[PDB]
């Protein structure tokens, strides 16, 4: 459940989520995040 355009990414929880190409998906570096 992402909310962004493809080619913009942004800051999420404890990592950055690169908006996929469908405008509704994200990669998110995903390294760690206790809260």
UniProtKB/Swiss-Prot annotation:
Tree of life domain: Eukaryota
Disulfide feature: 4-19, 14-33, 17-28
Residue ranges of every copy of the Pacifastin domain listed in the record: 1-35
Residues of the site described as Reactive bond: 30-31
Described function: In vitro, is active against alpha-chymotrypsin and pancreatic elastase.
The protein's name in its UniProt record: Protease inhibitor SGPI-2
Organism field: Schistocerca gregaria
Origin organism lineage: Eukaryota, Metazoa, Ecdysozoa, Arthropoda, Hexapoda
Residues of the full protein shown: 57 to 91 of 92
